[PDB]
Amino acid sequence: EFQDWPIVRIAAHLPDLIVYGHFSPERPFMDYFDGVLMFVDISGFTAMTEKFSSAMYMDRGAEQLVEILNYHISAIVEKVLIFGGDILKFAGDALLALWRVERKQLKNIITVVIKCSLEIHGLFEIRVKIGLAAGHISMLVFGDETHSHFLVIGQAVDDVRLAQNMAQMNDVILSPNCWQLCDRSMIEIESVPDQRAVKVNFLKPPPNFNFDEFFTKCTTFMHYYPSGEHKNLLRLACTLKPDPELEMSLQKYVMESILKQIDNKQLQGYLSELRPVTIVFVNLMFEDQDKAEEIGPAIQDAYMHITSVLKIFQGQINKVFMFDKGCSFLCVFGFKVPDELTHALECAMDIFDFCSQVHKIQTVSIGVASGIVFCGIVGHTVRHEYTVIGQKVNLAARMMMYYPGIVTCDSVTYNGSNLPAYFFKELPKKVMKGVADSGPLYQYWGRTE
Ligand SMILES: Cc1c(Cc2ccccc2)c(-c2cc(Cl)nc(N)n2)nn1C
């Protein structure tokens, strides 16, 4: 069976949530369901990135980095897929996986995901941290007529965010509501100081219990688990056949440079690079009260302006995330123009000005950093995404969190701009979660007072 159709190559970049959805054209589009979430933290990715930028790697740092990274990450992807999970998004530091099922089946599926989680630790006993959560989940699709983006929002997402914070290497942390819905007859835990979540230590099954027949029964509730003649496939998406209408909407989720490579109009090795870029990390904060029904329209309206300003200054959206009531856009400049830095700052300020006027948006924060970052396709053959990794990526992320409400930039961006100093204001250097002295940070003030 021939399976190398463009539509299949596009499907590799997307979860089943998008590939087999049937959304309206409306934007925003919301849907709601229940499932289990898995967040896998990889620690080392960013640290090793600066290692591979050394001259020891003789200008093959990027090629070597993506190779060793994909060696580990595709092993994590395989475990997730064979246990029936759907990988939603990759980022330099992590991936998020989803098991969407009927509410009545969450108890059984949590045991599946916990088992999955421990086999993933088994791969590296180079370490990871895993948080799990279960409950209600909302899906947000937004974009314009040629571009689409998605997010999962809700308690379960925030739950998996908190279980994220506590885990150390080799941990598997269950959110409180995941502990309350799980099969406690089977999961031995230990509590977390000043927390309602729990750490998992062992999965002790009843004597009669046989996981493989149990797992096979759970697949009954997994609409898209490969079976029958397709039991040896990792993804049913490998079996997609040409369908112009479906490919039309799927390609909107994928960056045009990726589509070029999918279309064999570009060297397949052209996208793994250690490249100078400017990262513009835009954070849109909402209040605790705000529910998904009100969030989606604000992000849509923010996104509509963001994309038009980015196209003007020649930037792209690399990744969209959301947690802790903040929706963040990882935007990249380069991958290049002579005065990239000035254009990055002016793009930030414009974004800051318009978005701060969208209502339901309580706060806009934007971090800007510039340097060498790894850019590449990360994941497994059947499930992968273009992704940027590097210390400058983490800096822009921590700046927009530690300096809310303003536009911040780093020392590299500050000196390299063609704008004069008084457009900036040097800031008090705060200590941040994994910052080996930033260097001097600045507020982009603007042209006048
Ligand atoms: C780091 C990362 C995130 C942000 C995130 C971090 C911790 C808990 C929950 C979300 C997402 C993500 C994906 C989707 Cl589809 N929706 C939302 N809301 N977030 N994916 N990845 C790889």
Provide the token pair at 193.
């100081």
Please tell me the number of Cα atoms within 13 Å of 97 on its side-chain side: 31
Does 93 show up as a binding residue in the annotation?
A: yes
Best of 42, 89, 383, 385 to mutate for ligand 1, by most ligand atoms within 8 A of CB?
89
Residues with Cβ within 8 Å of 199's Cβ and at least 6 positions away in sequence, in order, are: 166, 167, 171, 172, 173, 174, 189, 190, 191, 192
* CB atoms near residue 431 (< 10 Å): 8
In whole angstroms, how far apart are CA 76 and each of 10, 103, 120, 266, 379? 21, 26, 6, 28, 9
Dihedral angle of Cα 160, 163, 168, 171, to the nearest 10 degrees = -80
Q: Is the CB of 395 under 6 A from ligand 1?
A: no
Does 394 show up as a binding residue in the annotation?
A: yes
Q: Is the CB of 378 under 6 A from ligand 1?
A: no
Task: Give the separation between CA 123 and CA 40, rounded to whole angstroms.
Answer: 13
Provide the token pair at 175.
């959110």
What angle (nearest 5°) sits at the alpha carbon of residue 324, between those of residues 431 and 180? 120
CATH of 270-449, one of 3.40.50.300, 3.30.70.20, 3.40.50.12780, 3.30.70.1230: 3.30.70.1230
DSSP state of 430: -
Task: Give the separation between CA 405 and CA 429, rounded to whole angstroms.
Answer: 16
Residue listed under structure tokens 């200054």? 313
Residue listed under structure tokens 């390609």? 251
Q: Is the CB of 329 under 6 A from ligand 1?
A: no
CATH of 28-237, one of 3.40.47.10, 3.30.1360.40, 3.40.50.10480, 3.30.70.1230: 3.30.70.1230
DSSP of 178-237: HHHHS-TTTEEEEE-TT-S-EEEEEE---TT--HHHHHHHHGGG-TT---GGGTT-S-GG
Characterize the bridge pairing of strands 407-409 and 363-380: parallel
Q: Where are the chain's structural domains?
A: 28-237, 270-449
Task: Give the separation between CA 365 and CA 284, rounded to whole angstroms.
Answer: 7
Say whether 270-449 and 28-237 share the same fold.
yes
Q: Give φ, ψ of 245 to 5 degrees.
A: -60, -45
Q: Is the CB of 152 under 6 A from ligand 1?
A: yes
* Beta bridge partners of residue 190, listed in sequence order: 199
Q: Is the CB of 150 under 6 A from ligand 1?
A: yes
Q: Are 100 and 88 in contact (CB under 8 A)?
A: no
Nearest to 365 by CA among 393, 327, 392: 327
